[PDB]
Amino acid sequence: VLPNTALKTSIQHVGMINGRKLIKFETRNEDDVVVLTGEAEIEQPVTTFVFTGQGSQEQGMGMDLYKTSKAAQDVWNRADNHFKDTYGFSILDIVINNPVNLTIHFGGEKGKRIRENYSAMIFETIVDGKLKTEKIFKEINEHSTSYTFRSEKGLLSATQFTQPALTLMEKAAFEDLKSKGLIPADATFAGHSLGEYAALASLADVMSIESLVEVVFYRGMTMQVAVPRDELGRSNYGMIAINPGRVAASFSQEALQYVVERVGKRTGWLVEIVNYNVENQQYVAAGDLRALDTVTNVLNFIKLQKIDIIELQKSLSLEEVEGHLFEIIDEASKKSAVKPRPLKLERGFACIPLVGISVPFHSTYLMNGVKPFKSFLKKNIIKENVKVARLAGKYIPNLTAKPFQVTKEYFQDVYDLTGSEPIKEIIDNWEKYEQS
């Protein structure tokens, strides 16, 4: 109750969240009185959420969060039940106690579950790395008791168990924040070569939990067979990192393309200006290292070009091929990584690859345009219109559903605003394996 003017004091605090923030305050008087209830207003800020990067994996991995919330608990156990109902081993038995180099062997008795485990739901894996119908990783013909995995650095390795483990850890780590109403009606979505998968698998989910963990382990197996090479085990691939290079950032962006006149390599993910990745074909880490260490001998931008490069460089590339066969790297203006593949040079590793597999277990009823902000990798925002920049990527249905289409209906909701996204999000899921 009120009048005109003789003032007051009050108490103020940050109540809860609702879906934003929630504040707690009510107005009083001089010795703190009370009437006319209490104010609120959930004041928040322009949030932005992102994702992981497939590189900081370890033993712990949010297993303290596993015991914390039941919602954090069960989602970690949900697909865990689904694993042994598809392919028997508990990932929770993997990451809590790491099955170090002698890993799990698939005990897998031939009773009721023979057709589910030592049969179909495995032994249908096809690699398009060579001549197409190449069934992956044989000696799992009909009997084949105890097909056995083993690493040599602990089981949390091989980009095969870590990738389903990494996407399940942070996903349940996000949903506790969903449990306490810490998310606005719209925000940002990002990923870095794995978090794009756990983007519409995370907040704004379109898939099930068990649909996620299959297609990661599908993919986390698929990247391993990107190249048939070295029966003992060694790689002709690799990744290298870089400094700024006596000022840089399109310093050598064309100059690496002068190296691929002759042999062929790419850049990895253009992550920063002070950070870059280059897709390596093994001699680049050895032969072109002096080619990039020639330039730290003091040389910045000078005048006009075309009297120039690799007549100096290929004096050094063919110089250590006689040095070794699977050459160990070096530092000096080139910090090495330790992978064994690419992230773009796959090229012909779609078509019937994951490109085929996504039609299973991700097709139709794929939500609304609530994900109009899933600005995925190698793109810009998310708008269901004349996104012609998708055609400059990997053409297939993207000139079959493009100019053949364009207003082939009435642009209503129902299915027209469902199928249009269903193709392109499949197509956004397409060469994300490729195109670094």
Side-chain angles (χ1 to χ4, degrees), residues 3 6 15 19 38 40 45 53-326 332 337 340 342 348 350 353 356 360 369 372 389 392-393 397 401 403 419 422:
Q54 211 256 334
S56 194
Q57 40 267 20
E58 53 199 23
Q59 156 72 64
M61 211 86 75
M63 276 303 118
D64 45 356
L65 196 37
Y66 167 71
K67 71 182 288 292
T68 313
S69 154
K70 295 302 139 185
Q73 183 171 345
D74 71 320
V75 184
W76 253 97
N77 308 139
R78 185 73 33 83
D80 204 19
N81 185 273
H82 163 245
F83 276 112
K84 39 198 185 181
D85 282 339
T86 287
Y87 206 45
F89 46 89
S90 159
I91 292 297
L92 190 145
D93 203 277
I94 306 310
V95 80
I96 270 174
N97 39 358
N98 200 348
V100 75
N101 315 339
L102 185 151
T103 82
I104 309 306
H105 48 57
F106 255 104
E109 279 218 8
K110 303 262 186 86
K112 55 191 73 67
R113 297 169 189 263
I114 173 181
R115 78 144 189 85
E116 283 184 292
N117 299 273
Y118 284 25
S119 314
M121 300 323 169
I122 210 67
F123 205 49
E124 287 89 47
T125 50
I126 290 185
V127 57
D128 46 352
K130 284 311 287 175
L131 310 172
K132 291 283 292 296
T133 49
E134 195 183 3
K135 297 210 161 190
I136 309 163
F137 275 5
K138 317 276 220 289
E139 70 94 23
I140 327 177
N141 201 231
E142 47 95 20
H143 35 278
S144 307
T145 317
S146 178
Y147 170 56
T148 289
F149 285 98
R150 40 164 307 170
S151 166
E152 284 186 350
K153 38 164 154 172
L155 188 42
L156 268 303
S157 53
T159 77
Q160 183 202 5
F161 296 85
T162 47
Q163 303 189 357
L166 195 94
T167 182
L168 169 56
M169 170 262 294
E170 47 164 35
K171 162 75 187 199
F174 190 81
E175 299 332 288
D176 175 75
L177 309 175
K178 184 63 69 67
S179 69
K180 287 202 179 58
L182 314 170
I183 289 95
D186 265 324
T188 77
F189 304 98
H192 176 66
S193 172
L194 196 54
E196 302 87 331
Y197 297 94
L200 280 303
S202 52
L203 71 158
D205 200 351
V206 295
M207 69 203 77
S208 89
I209 303 164
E210 49 268 38
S211 51
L212 179 61
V213 293
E214 205 89 51
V215 309
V216 175
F217 184 76
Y218 191 99
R219 173 204 178 275
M221 199 48 238
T222 316
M223 303 294 188
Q224 191 64 258
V225 288
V227 53
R229 185 65 266 164
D230 206 287
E231 68 272 357
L232 180 75
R234 264 80 47 94
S235 85
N236 59 315
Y237 280 66
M239 310 311 163
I240 324 290
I242 206 187
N243 209 21
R246 316 303 166 170
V247 185
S250 300
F251 199 68
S252 195
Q253 187 165 4
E254 300 183 358
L256 54 91
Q257 284 297 106
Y258 283 117
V259 186
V260 304
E261 150 190 348
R262 285 303 308 122
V263 283
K265 47 140 170 185
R266 310 195 190 194
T267 73
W269 275 110
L270 324 170
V271 280
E272 262 316 291
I273 167 169
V274 303
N275 204 323
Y276 282 95
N277 321 313
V278 277
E279 303 207 341
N280 198 291
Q281 191 39 62
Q282 207 270 349
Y283 44 75
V284 173
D288 302 295
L289 190 146
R290 296 174 185 87
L292 309 168
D293 219 15
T294 318
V295 195
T296 185
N297 313 283
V298 278
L299 189 58
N300 279 109
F301 174 73
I302 331 106
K303 297 157 299 306
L304 80 160
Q305 315 168 6
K306 308 311 283 297
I307 38 175
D308 266 350
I309 214 125
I310 75 156
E311 81 240 9
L312 305 176
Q313 275 65 10
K314 295 285 157 182
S315 59
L316 323 168
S317 88
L318 305 172
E319 202 185 12
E320 317 304 311
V321 50
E322 56 93 17
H324 211 71
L325 78 163
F326 271 99

